[PDB]
């Protein structure tokens, strides 16, 4: 028998980055938002641990220990004292090297799929502890929906929305090195005052009300000035999406991926068509959010 689990990629609707300290850590507060670009991960009992990926960028990815999904299987098996005697087949649609944390998504899917394949139901709290050891975006991939996160090792606070939101997401081909982005954020903070965000209250309120008009100008990312300084083309890409009809655009996380909020599914399609036509991006996709975290779909 087989289990398959669907797990979404994410965007950051809000990201505050604390001042650097030692050894060079920045505390983060973030509103993670899972969207309907998803991987499907299928796990079977097998003689030995194995991993295969298929889908658009599947060719780029390690299929051994370097793959987070491979570590997830190891950790999950070890937690219940078992050998990771499973084979894992990942059907990938979350854009690879996209900033949407697809590898973290797959890791969380493997935890859930093994839980179910082995008929164990280790408790959610144990799966979240394993997520935390795996890496900083695995917990949100298990959690999904929308959640406010407040540092690592801290829980995620669930945030419910009255309505679905409609997104156009735009991808460069090269990303940006997250270390480059932090260094430049530190620099911009030594030499000036780049955008500083208020606290996430207003963002959460707009989110709870299901109201894209209220949410749009509250979207924000303290990493965005650094990313646009390293990658001046992002600024034009952001203007272009809004010119095409989006309510707002921001860079998601460390960038360079750009998230544009639209009023509706129709409008997102129009915006996407125009941005795709304007060649400011390598790839343009539409998506909705929030969607659920890792869950069995077989
Ligand atoms: N501590 C870490 N250092 C570097 N990469 C990490 C770490 N933890 C998780 N990851 C990343 O999670 C990624 C998921 O990949 P993918 O979503 O395709 O692109 P993105 O990582 O830009 O969101 C893996 O490629 C891996 O690089």
Swiss-Prot record:
Q: Which residues bind ATP?
A: 95-105
Report the catalytic activity.
4-CDP-2-C-methyl-D-erythritol + ATP = 4-CDP-2-C-methyl-D-erythritol 2-phosphate + ADP + H(+)
Keyword Transferase attached = yes
Q: Please name the Gene3D superfamilies in this protein's record.
A: 3.30.230.10, GHMP kinase, C-terminal domain (3.30.70.890)
Q: In which pathway does it act?
A: Isoprenoid biosynthesis; isopentenyl diphosphate biosynthesis via DXP pathway; isopentenyl diphosphate from 1-deoxy-D-xylulose 5-phosphate: step 3/6
> Could you tell me the keywords of this UniProt record?
ATP-binding, Isoprene biosynthesis, Kinase, Nucleotide-binding, Transferase
Look up the EC number in the record and give it: 2.7.1.148
Domain of life, per the record? Answer: Bacteria
Q: Does the keyword ATP-binding apply?
A: yes
Top enzyme class: transferase
Name a Pfam family for this protein.
Answer: GHMP_kinases_N
InterPro entries per the record? GHMP_kinase_C_dom, GHMP_kinase_C_sf, GHMP_kinase_N_dom, IspE, Ribosomal_Su5_D2-typ_SF, Ribsml_uS5_D2-typ_fold_subgr
For this chain, one GO molecular function annotation is: 4-(cytidine 5'-diphospho)-2-C-methyl-D-erythritol kinase activity
One of the GO BP terms on file: isopentenyl diphosphate biosynthetic process, methylerythritol 4-phosphate pathway
Query: What family does the Swiss-Prot or TrEMBL record give for this protein?
Result: Belongs to the GHMP kinase family. IspE subfamily.
Q: What does this protein do?
A: Catalyzes the phosphorylation of the position 2 hydroxy group of 4-diphosphocytidyl-2C-methyl-D-erythritol.
> What PANTHER family does the record point to?
4-DIPHOSPHOCYTIDYL-2-C-METHYL-D-ERYTHRITOL KINASE, CHLOROPLASTIC
**Which protein is depicted?**
4-diphosphocytidyl-2-C-methyl-D-erythritol kinase
């Amino acid at each position: 028998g087989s289990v398959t689990v669907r797990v979404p990629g994410k965007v950051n609707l809000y990201l505050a980055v604390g001042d650097r300290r030692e050894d060079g850590y920045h505390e983060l507060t973030t509103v993670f938002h899972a969207v309907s670009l998803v991987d499907e991960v299928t796990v079977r009992n097998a003689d030995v641990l194995s991993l295969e990926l298929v889908g658009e960028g599947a060719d780029q990815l390690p299929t051994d220990e370097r793959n987070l999904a491979w570590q997830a299987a190891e950790l999950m098996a070890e937690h219940v004292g078992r050998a990771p005697d499973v084979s894992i087949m990942i059907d990938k649609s979350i854009p690879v090297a996209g900033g949407m944390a697809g590898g973290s998504a797959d890791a969380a899917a493997v935890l859930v799929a093994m839980n179910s394949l082995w008929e164990l139901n280790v408790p959610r709290r144990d799966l979240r502890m394993l997520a935390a050891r795996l890496g900083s975006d695995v917990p949100f991939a298990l959690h999904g929906g929308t959640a406010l996160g407040t540092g690592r090792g801290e829980e995620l606070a669930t945030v419910l929305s009255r309505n679905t939101f409609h997104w156009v997401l735009a991808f460069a081909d090269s990303g940006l090195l997250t270390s480059a982005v932090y260094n430049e954020l530190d620099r911009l903070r030594e030499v000036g005052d780049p955008p500083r965000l208020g606290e996430p209250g207003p963002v959460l309120a707009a989110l709870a009300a299901g109201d894209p008009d209220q949410l749009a100008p509250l979207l924000g990312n303290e990493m965005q000035a650094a990313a646009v300084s390293l990658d001046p083309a992002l600024a034009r890409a952001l203007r272009a999406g809004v010119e095409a009809g989006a309510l707002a655009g921001i860079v998601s996380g460390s960038g360079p991926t750009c998230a544009f909020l639209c009023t509706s599914a129709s409008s997102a399609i129009d915006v996407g068509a125009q941005l795709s036509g304007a060649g400011v991006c390598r790839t343009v996709r539409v998506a909705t959010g929030p969607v659920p975290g890792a869950r069995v779909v077989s």
